Structure 1
Amino acid sequence: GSRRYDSRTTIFSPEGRLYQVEYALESISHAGTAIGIMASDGIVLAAERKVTSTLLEQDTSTEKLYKLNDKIAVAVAGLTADAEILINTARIHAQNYLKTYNEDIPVEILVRRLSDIKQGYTQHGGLRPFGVSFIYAGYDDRYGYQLYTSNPSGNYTGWKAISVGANTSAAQTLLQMDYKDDMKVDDAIELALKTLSKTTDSSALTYDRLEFATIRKGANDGEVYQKIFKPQEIKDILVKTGIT
């Protein structure tokens, strides 16, 4: 019968590893680098677009940074198509929680459920896992500003600063070097860009090859604002830190 053609996506190696999870992570390691840095007064999300073409429409484009609700955003590393399936699920899960409890979903609860979905694809169903790693940047009234990451294994962890995709080894060393706890958002913006600028496989880091977002309490009195940076705003912040 069909047994002949089954890849057996949800099995263990003799060493006790999940083949497909390991190979999905190998896929993600080639994806454009995405950095998340958590400050005391906000969070930065920076992501490098995959080798841009000059005729790509930059302003009306979304590849790396996606909005889940008004308080939570994600940076993507891997298959965009796979990420969008999981994002629409995450967006619905957030609205289900709001409908049920009349309260915005706590960041960790959203992260756990999305991570539990990925876990399922590694343990049952005989389907390939999602070739996606997320950086979750969000705020709630319990833990305040939070950075998480999830990977195809369905394992998630919390971070002060973290990178996913390409050159994470090099990127994580540079963040571990210059990061400190009393750091402000404007400082974290500079660190995020400086890290990409050094780890980039490109010749020079330009506005047209970046997606940028901040989650500040920089609105008016005790409320959070999500800022998905426009092309011209990335061009200005890149000049202001003296990279171009």
Structure 2
Amino acid sequence: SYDRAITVFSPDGHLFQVEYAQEAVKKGSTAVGVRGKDIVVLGVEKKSVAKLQDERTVRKICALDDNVCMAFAGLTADARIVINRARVECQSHRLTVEDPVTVEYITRYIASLKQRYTQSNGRRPFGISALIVGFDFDGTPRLYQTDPSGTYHAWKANAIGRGAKSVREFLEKNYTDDAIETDDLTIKLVIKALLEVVQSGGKNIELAVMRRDQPLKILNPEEIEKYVAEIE
């Protein structure tokens, strides 16, 4: 078996492998997340907008369970592995405990796995960042964000990917308690943040939503075109 240490410390106390894994996330597609009052929005920028491509097989916004869903940025092949592990953990938590997992519980589990790949032999770190969003049993909108290192934080509105610095900056001076007043202003907020970074904004912006006690819904080409015209 391969047992060589891949991630090790450097002279100035840096884990090069983890920093190189975070560099891959910056080259990935932009994915923003906004936490509203009774709604959670996840928007992703479809870099490749090929017309010969089946859009249903390249989606970035998945579902971990009935109340938890997530988006990612970076290596697509790594994300799938992580998402499948998180899905298996959700069913395991529904078996042992007789209740659904909380958004922080699965975020903690995904972060725990990521950290393990940064301190194990014969394996490199995951090159993705996740934006776990969902609702707890009480009906509270949660928005967490994990990264390659294995550190997770709960946010109000966050963007990850290439144009995350810009989106975040724009979100900082746009996300208020009046900007997320309803279930339409939150959607208009996610689309606004994505529109200032996504080339030819409009048909290159997939976005799903999640309301309290409700599965996950992915707005289509027409639904999202009405929100993009409303803004103007």
What's the TM-score once normalised by structure 2's chain length?
Answer: 0.92
Counterpart check, 1:14 vs 2:11: yes
Aligned to 2:113: 117
Which amino acid in structure 2 is aligned with residue 211 of structure 1? Answer: E
Consecutive unaligned residues of structure 1, counting only runs of 5 or more, are 218-222
Aligned to 2:226: 236
Structure 1 residue 185 displacement after superposition: 2.8
Counterpart check, 1:32 vs 2:29: yes
Distance 2:66 2:187 in 1: 20
Structure 1 residue 166 displacement after superposition: 0.7
Which amino acid in structure 2 is aligned with residue 236 of structure 1? Answer: K
Aligned to 2:207: 212
Structure 1 residue 143 displacement after superposition: 7.0
What percentage of aligned pairs have identical amino acids?
36
Secondary structure at 1:35 match in 2 = strand
Q: Is the Cα–Cα contact under 8 Å of residues 119 and 153 in structure 1 kept in the other structure? A: yes
1:1-244 pair list within 5 angstroms: 8-58=5-55, 60-142=56-138, 144-182=140-178, 183=180, 184-200=182-198, 202=199, 204-207=200-203, 209-217=204-212, 223-242=213-232
Q: Is the Cα–Cα contact under 8 Å of residues 195 and 202 in structure 2 kept in the other structure? A: no
* Of 160-169 and 139-148, the range deviating more from structure 2: 139-148
Distance 1:173 1:53 in 2: 30
Q: Is the Cα–Cα contact under 8 Å of residues 63 and 80 in structure 1 kept in the other structure? A: no
Aligned to 1:220: none
Secondary structure at 1:11 match in 2 = coil
Q: Please list the CA deviations of residues 168-189 of structure 1 after superposition, one character each: whole Å capped at 9, or x if unmatched.
A: 1111110000111352331111
Distance 1:17 1:228 in 2: 40
Secondary structure at 1:21 match in 2 = helix
Q: Is the Cα–Cα contact under 8 Å of residues 9 and 19 in structure 1 kept in the other structure? A: no
Distance 2:122 2:139 in 1: 37
More helix by share: 1
Distance 1:106 1:70 in 2: 11
Distance 1:127 1:172 in 2: 32
What's the TM-score once normalised by structure 1's chain length?
Answer: 0.88
- Residues 9 and 237 of structure 1: CA distance in aligned 2, closer, same or farther (over 3 Å): same
Root-mean-square deviation (Å):
1.8
Secondary structure at 1:231 match in 2 = coil
- Residues 121 and 143 of structure 1: CA distance in aligned 2, closer, same or farther (over 3 Å): farther
Distance 2:163 2:195 in 1: 12
Q: Is the Cα–Cα contact under 8 Å of residues 194 and 205 in structure 2 kept in the other structure? A: no
Structure 1 residue 142 displacement after superposition: 4.7
Q: Is the Cα–Cα contact under 8 Å of residues 44 and 185 in structure 1 kept in the other structure? A: no
Q: Please list the CA deviations of residues 83-135 of structure 1 after superposition, one character each: whole Å capped at 9, or x if unmatched.
A: 01010110110111111112010111111011101100001123111111000
Structure 1 residue 159 displacement after superposition: 0.2
